[PDB]
A paper describes a structure:
U-Omp19 is a bacterial protease inhibitor from Brucella abortus that inhibits gastrointestinal and lysosomal proteases, enhancing the half-life and immunogenicity of co-delivered antigens. The latter domain behaves as an intrinsically disordered protein and retains the full protease inhibitor activity against pancreatic elastase, papain and pepsin.
In silico studies have predicted that U-Omp19 is structurally related to the Inh domain, a characteristic β-barrel present in proteins belonging to the I38 family of bacterial protease inhibitors. To understand the mechanistic basis of U-Omp19 activities, in this work we performed a structural, biochemical, and functional characterization of it.
Numbering used by the authors: -314 to -144, -140 to 61, 65 to 162
The structure:
């Protein structure tokens, strides 16, 4: 079990855990309660496994949207902070940590997309989406483009679609009220597609093409989150970050992710955990300790957010967050993503109309949400694989170690084209193996439990079979 009298905290490795440990020691000095801070591998999926068996950390830090499945799965303690304490965090951040009208976590930090522009190419960026066609003709005359952003993931195209009325589920979330083909969503997506029809954007621009274009000075604007600011400091491109453009006078509504701190329902230290988070972490000094270790971005605590907002990039993030739509914390969100990604791709590729793509998307999303359980997941690929080809055979490694928009991969005495394996990724139902130059080496599909079948980019058959042992 979880051990009484001590606090165990899990937080991801890309966070200021040493700063969090600092706050933990200040808490150990005033109370004698020891605070151990850990950053396990794949913590967001170890936690449900251990908490369901009465073990795990006392506190877990993760994005709010996963906590609704935890709370629906009764793996989280209900928190009841005083009204006086709730007033210190932005009111919308408490909405992100609400499930069935109960508070299930403490909001910590806040994240949302924002308009990123090149101040040299574009000193004063547009306030409206309507201005972007004219701005694009001006810039392409001079060999640049006005705007490029990932058109492949609904997360990036949703702020415009939802600007005039689109929404995932109505909000208590009603999984049978999907707002995907109302008038506002049709209008946003139609405007998006006509931008592509009128040759201001390319239907197949994805995350890397857009990021490369902006950092190489080829386009004046992009759309991304704080996670991408670091690669634009390598750029020496002088960029600003600002509010998203408005559509039909309505703000772009990006999805909002809220870093939150949940309490293990099996923890015998619930009250100790509430005191640490309320009285020690969620203070100007506590947040500063984590932030000096590793920046949080915008934060839910008003007082310290007023200090961080002196950075205009963080003020812009927070402003776009307060105008966006909180990412719904329900597992039925996976049906929203699947249906909407199909619809935006089909509408932008001309394979469907926005009225037909969105109509299908709302039918498929509503039906799948109402149903007990689509694409291939990087968890199902992570590991080491036997690789049969001809009479030849060998092994490849495909760790879930991020690398670009894919993952590191490695061949182990592999003949033929597999000797060039360097990265891997998943595309719906398809596993794709890549060069060190981004070229495609192979394409495979899950053909069963721990088994892949496909072919190289040059015709040779490939079969992947998992390595695994027994005690």
């Amino acid at each position: 079990k979880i051990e009484e009298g001590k606090l165990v905290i899990w937080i991801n490795g890309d966070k200021g855990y040493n700063g969090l440990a600092e706050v933990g020691k200040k808490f150990e000095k005033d109370t004698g309660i020891k605070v151990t801070v850990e950053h396990p591998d794949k913590l967001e999926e170890k936690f449900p496994q251990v908490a369901a068996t009465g073990d795990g950390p006392d506190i877990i830090f993760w994005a709010h949207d996963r906590f609704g499945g935890y709370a629906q799965s009764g793996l989280l303690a209900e928190i009841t902070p005083a009204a006086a304490f709730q007033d210190k965090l932005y009111p919308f951040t408490w909405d992100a940590v609400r499930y069935n009208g109960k508070l299930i976590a403490y909001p910590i930090a806040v994240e949302a997309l924002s308009l990123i522009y090149n101040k040299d190419l574009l000193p004063n960026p547009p306030k409206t989406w309507e201005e972007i066609p004219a701005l694009d003709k001006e810039l392409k005359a001079k060999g640049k483009s006005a705007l490029m952003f990932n058109l492949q993931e609904p997360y990036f195209t949703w702020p415009l679609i939802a600007a005039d009325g689109g929404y995932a589920f109505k909000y208590k979330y009603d999984i049978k009220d999907v707002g995907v083909d109302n008038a506002g969503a049709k209008a946003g997506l139609t405007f998006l597609v006509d931008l592509i029809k009128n040759k201001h954007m390319n239907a197949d621009t994805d995350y890397s093409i857009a990021e490369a274009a902006f950092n190489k000075g080829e386009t004046a604007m992009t759309i991304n989150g704080p996670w991408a600011w670091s690669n634009i400091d390598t750029s020496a491109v002088n960029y600003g970050v600002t509010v998203l453009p408005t559509f039909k006078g309505q703000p772009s509504k990006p999805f909002v992710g809220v870093l939150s701190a949940g309490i293990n329902a099996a923890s015998p230290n619930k009250e100790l955990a509430k005191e640490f988070l309320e009285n020690y972490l969620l203070t100007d000094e506590g947040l500063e300790a984590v932030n000096k270790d590793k920046p949080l971005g915008a934060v839910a605590l008003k007082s310290y957010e007023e200090e961080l907002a002196k950075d205009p990039r963080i003020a812009a993030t927070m402003e776009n967050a307060q105008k966006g739509e909180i990412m719904p914390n329900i597992p039925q969100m996976s049906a929203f993503w699947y249906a909407v990604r199909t619809a935006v791709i089909n509408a932008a590729s001309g394979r469907q109309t926005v009225d037909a793509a969105l109509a299908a998307a709302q039918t498929n999303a509503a039906a799948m949400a109402s149903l007990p359980p689509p694409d291939l997941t990087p968890g199902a690929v992570a590991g080491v694989w036997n690789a049969s080809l001809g009479g030849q055979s060998c092994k490849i490694a495909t760790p879930q170690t991020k690398y670009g928009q894919g993952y590191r991969a490695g061949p182990l005495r592999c003949p033929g084209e597999l000797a060039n394996l360097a990265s891997w990724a998943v595309n719906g139902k398809q596993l794709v193996l890549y060069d060190a130059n981004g070229g495609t080496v192979a394409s495979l599909y899950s053909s069963g439990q721990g088994r892949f079948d496909g072919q190289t980019t040059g015709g040779q058959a490939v079969t992947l079979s998992r390595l695994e042992h027994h005690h």
